[PDB]
Ligand binder design. Structure first.
Ligand SMILES: Cc1ncc(COP(=O)(O)O)c(CN[C@@H]2CONC2=O)c1O
Ligand SMILES: Cc1ncc(COP(=O)(O)O)c(CN[C@@H]2CONC2=O)c1O
Ligand SMILES: [Cl-]
Lengths: 380, 382
């Protein structure tokens, strides 16, 4: 690549899960590789993680997990975002743990297990307060009654019971101890109606890094696997011992001199104060560069951190080097490692008024990924 | 048909939009701009649709997007302008692609390339008339203009056109507009006198095309308007401008349940139910292209009524408050589509997320499948 590409370090990835493994000594690890691994490459990161000690693999959509098996990845895998008509049968045949939050899901899977002549491994999801997916406390008895019954009929096998936190990245939030308590009480009742789960889990990356009383048998870690801290309130990847996996770089396409008082970019939302040097970065919002980052986004050009000049276009944006010099083809680092003096996904989150989760995840397809580290077959 | 979420592209809306646009610049050619996967609509399918409908030129930003079009079997004139040292000059020249030169480093590369390729490269000179983005500054025109006419004589290149791009065309009656138009006539002319005979002179994008007839010249570069979306509300709705929206984003509810009064919804708990009600889970989040920034305002059409994103929008989904109404898993929700059909539109979302329509349709995820209608059967094979 010469215009813009993403450099993924697989050694950073492996070291992260080894760090996270130590953080929860008595628990099992679940590397979440959903959404193309938050933009780093689903399969490469799935193999690296697993190699480093990942016992489970989790994704959102059935398609995402199927594609994981398609690439010959063994071990326990699980998905949780189903919609009526999903590929229940296919998932069951590949021995993937599908999740259930309602009777409709349970009924769809039970019928699929029949056609497949096999038993689906299912995990019941408790809605302990997030109010997103999962079963409400008011319908827990009912759904729990059906599982054990569908279990007796040998059609399904309840392998686990799980929930998910709403403000776990906000240390001290009252909503946290609530859900955690509601989790225990819901688990008891189900464990009493004839359910012996293979795994018990509720924690995510922030919960994992903060509350041990929430580790149980398994922990589902996503973002931290990529060396990005869930929130500033928890620390920088550096303080967390996490190492950034992606480095986004580009080459300048033009460097010119313009008189003082010259407008730059759409809407001329930036006017040159004095005759200066204007560089051109060939990466716009279609490549994943937030347009709300207009005027703030940091770029590492010529030994100094520069700022987005004016509006950010679909394909490119300009930067004012001032007195400094540079030429077409030169390297620019839009986001990378804080330990290398470069900008980070957090820096851009703040610049764009969003979160580090969005920054990395929304990095386009038009942008090639280049792998380094891990083993050779990982780079596929 | 997709079970989670998907996008349907109406190829007839595309075919009709260009036929409308041409009738606006009667004495100028039309270059359809399908860069960025046709602003999220599917590059090859739309490129074919627009050609057959009347586009004489195709425009993409990068050489790769241009080499993909050729690789897909598309003929006719094509041009790309975003280049960096080491680009596929040779490959681009062999495939007969009009490229843009704004600096000398480019000229020397295409020259070395036209040499290896044993062919003459058709180049177009970009002039920076105010945008301050790309193109030659007025103070380096003669230098570039000179070296060019020199490359001509050597038989390496061939200057096929002189152009430029506006900064505030989409802002009706902006001072920058006239100022930029003026520089064009002066910079262009000089190039003529010094020898250059251009095949085409262009400067108009969608807004300028729709508003200023004196910006047409030989060619006109229209991107957004071709897909039925209007550059700016300050120009009207696709309806008034006489345009038909081409994209329709639909998803299927995954869950619908009842929750007690005072329950929190999503991360941070930014939304609390004022009473006992029905909540519905839409399985699509910011990884599919839904702006997280539209959290709490993004309009969706669910069960006969427009609902607002209840709380924080997530990576893979978000919830909507059905209130008293009822619905179920599998029922379809329309995120964005045709206002004429009483559906939320790209502008609606553009406003909700505090941005411009251009970015909404352009950033629709790749995890999101595309389904084509109308047009010619063979148009949706690649
Ligand atoms: C159920 C579940 N568990 C674990 C994770 C991993 O979380 P971290 O990345 O914070 O470690 C996620 C991802 N959460 C997102 C965020 O938005 N939509 C989701 O599915 C999740 O949804
Ligand atoms: C150089 C160039 N020509 C023509 C067009 C087509 O313009 P319309 O889409 O308005 O018809 C664009 C706009 N492309 C975008 C839009 O925003 N930033 C860009 O680079 C462009 O960049
Ligand atoms: Cl130069």
């Amino acid at each position: 690549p010469t215009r813009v590409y993403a450099e993924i370090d697989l050694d950073a990835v492996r070291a992260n899960v080894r760090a996270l493994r130590a953080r929860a000594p008595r628990s099992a690890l679940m590397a979440v590789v959903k959404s193309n691994a938050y933009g780093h490459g689903a399969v490469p990161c799935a193999r690296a993680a697993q190699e480093a000690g990942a016992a489970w693999l989790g994704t959102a959509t059935p398609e995402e997990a199927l594609e994981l098996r398609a690439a010959g990845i063994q071990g326990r895998i699980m998905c949780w975002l189903w919609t009526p008509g999903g590929p229940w049968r296919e998932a069951i045949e590949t021995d993937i743990d599908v999740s259930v939050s309602g009777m409709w899901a349970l009924d769809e899977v039970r019928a699929a297990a029949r056609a497949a002549g096999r038993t689906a491994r299912i995990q019941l999801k408790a809605d302990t307060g997030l109010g997103r997916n999962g079963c409400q406390p008011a319908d827990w008895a009912e759904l729990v009654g059906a599982a054990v019954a569908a279990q007796a009929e040998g059609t399904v096998q309840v392998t686990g019971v799980w929930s998910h936190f709403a403000c776990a990245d906000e240390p001290g939030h009252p909503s946290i101890r609530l859900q955690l308590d509601a989790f225990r009480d819901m688990l008891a009742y189900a464990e009493k109606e004839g359910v012996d789960p293979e795994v018990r889990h509720i924690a995510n990356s922030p919960a994992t890094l903060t509350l041990p009383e929430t580790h149980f048998d398994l922990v589902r870690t996503g973002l931290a696997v990529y060396g990005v801290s869930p929130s500033p309130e928890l620390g920088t990847p550096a303080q967390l011992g996490l190492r950034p996996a992606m480095t986004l770089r580009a080459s300048l396409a033009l460097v010119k001199t313009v008189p003082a008082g010259h407008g730059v970019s759409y809407g001329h939302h930036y006017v040159t104060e004095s005759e200066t040097h204007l560089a051109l970065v060939p990466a716009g919002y279609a490549d994943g560069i937030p347009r709300n980052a207009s005027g703030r986004g940091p770029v590492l050009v010529a030994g100094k951190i520069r700022r987005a000049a004016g509006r950010i276009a679909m394909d490119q944006f300009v930067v004012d080097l001032g007195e400094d010099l540079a030429e077409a083809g030169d390297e620019a680092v839009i986001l990378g490692d804080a330990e290398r003096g470069e900008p980070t996904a957090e820096d851009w989150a703040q610049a764009a008024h969003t979160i580090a989760y969005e920054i990395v995840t929304r990095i386009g397809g038009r942008v090639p990924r280049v792998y380094l580290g891990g083993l050779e077959h990982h780079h596929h």
